[PDB]
């Protein structure tokens, strides 16, 4: 899974906010591919199985997985 990052979020301008927005709002420490502005998803998280203390892969909220 490779999710499109919210360009408005990246420039400090997302008026929808993270909860509503259907694009990714990744943390500054999260792996991002600058070639296409996507974040590769943590597949463990999708299954409720990510127990890593500091995972560097995007954990998509429920409304993005929908
Ligand atoms: Zn957004
Ligand atoms: Zn994870």
From Swiss-Prot:
It is found in: Nucleus; Cytoplasm; Cytoplasmic granule. A zinc finger (C3H1-type) spans 1-28, 36-62. It comes from the Eukaryota. Highly expressed in cardiac, skeletal muscle and during myoblast differentiation. Weakly expressed in other tissues (at protein level). Expressed in heart, brain, placenta, lung, liver, skeletal muscle, kidney and pancreas. Mediates pre-mRNA alternative splicing regulation. Acts either as activator or repressor of splicing on specific pre-mRNA targets. Inhibits cardiac troponin-T (TNNT2) pre-mRNA exon inclusion but induces insulin receptor (IR) pre-mRNA exon inclusion in muscle. Antagonizes the alternative splicing activity pattern of CELF proteins. Regulates the TNNT2 exon 5 skipping through competition with U2AF2. Inhibits the formation of the spliceosome A complex on intron 4 of TNNT2 pre-mRNA. Binds to the stem-loop structure within the polypyrimidine tract of TNNT2 intron 4 during spliceosome assembly. It is linked to Dystrophia myotonica 1: A muscular disorder characterized by myotonia, muscle wasting in the distal extremities, cataract, hypogonadism, defective endocrine functions, male baldness and cardiac arrhythmias. Corneal dystrophy, Fuchs endothelial, 3: A late-onset form of Fuchs endothelial corneal dystrophy, a disease caused by loss of endothelium of the central cornea. It is characterized by focal wart-like guttata that arise from Descemet membrane and develop in the central cornea, epithelial blisters, reduced vision and pain. Descemet membrane is thickened by abnormal collagenous deposition. Interacts with DDX1 and YBX1. Interacts with HNRNPH1; the interaction in RNA-independent. Interacts with RBPMS; the interaction allows cooperative assembly of RNA-bound stable cell-specific alternative splicing regulatory complexes. Belongs to the muscleblind family. This is Muscleblind-like protein 1. It comes from Homo sapiens (Human). The lineage of its organism: Eukaryota, Metazoa, Chordata, Craniata, Vertebrata.
């Amino acid at each position: 899974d490779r999710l499109e990052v919210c360009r408005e979020y990246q420039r400090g301008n997302c008026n929808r906010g993270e909860n509503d927005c259907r694009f990714a709002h990744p943390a500054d420490s999260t792996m991002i591919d600058t070639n296409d502005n996507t974040v590769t998803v943590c597949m463990d998280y999708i299954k409720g199985r990510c127990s890593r203390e500091k995972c560097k892969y995007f954990h998509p909220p429920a409304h993005l997985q929908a």
